[PDB]
Symmetry: C2
Subunit: 133 residues, 2 copies
């Protein structure tokens, strides 16, 4: 019962606002982290501790096979059903999400050491660049 | 290249407000998600993809030895210095943080299958429960 190893997901959080008010936190950071699920990973070796605490919102996951249509229920996002299809266009992973919203989809490729992702919906395009870890 | 395995972290994000406003995502959600760095984990085996898109706000790690005093500079929080000491009270990991704030510290123990974290500062007490993953 002294070995507290493992990954821990927060399920309840009581009086977190008051604890941050007593520590004098810049309000904006308080209201951001007041409704975020914390996750603590503990690496304990007898008496040596290596703990890592993260504060996250929503983690979105999806599994697919390139070329196989699948019904994607984008929960946590817009909560809609879309007929999703992912194909290869050269070395660019392209996906089309057939649904109520038109021009919905995303591109994803890799140039060198960075991964690019261009989300598209209607007439708005979001571009994201990711570095490797 | 078509190989997209690994864990990537975002370093830029443009027009994310446009992609979320066009998706009819609620306003208060856009205001929070627009200032969070995302992380994408990709497991690829040919044309078989298992992706995980998480969104983190702030992280805070700390490494210590039970019983040994050490100086903790709580960056990304209140950015103060505390002379912290961690010792066992039975099976409850207790830490006192000698600093400007009085009654500052935390207690942490394992009961059954859940982690129990109790943060204290001044006259405010925070009670947190964590489930095992």
């Amino acid at each position: 019962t002294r070995d507290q190893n493992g990954t821990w997901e927060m399920e309840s959080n009581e009086n977190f606002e008051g604890y941050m008010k007593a520590l004098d936190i810049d309000f904006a950071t308080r209201k951001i982290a007041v409704r975020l699920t914390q996750t603590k990973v503990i690496d304990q070796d007898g008496d040596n501790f290596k703990t890592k605490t993260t504060s996250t919102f929503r983690n979105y996951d999806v599994d697919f096979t390139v070329g196989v249509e699948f019904d994607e229920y984008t929960k946590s996002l817009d909560n809609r059903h879309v007929k999703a299809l992912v194909t290869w266009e050269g070395d660019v992973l392209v996906c089309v999400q057939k649904g109520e919203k038109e021009n919905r989809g995303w591109k994803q490729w890799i140039e060198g050491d960075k991964l690019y992702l261009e989300l598209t919906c209607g007439d708005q395009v979001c571009r994201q660049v990711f570095k490797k870890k």
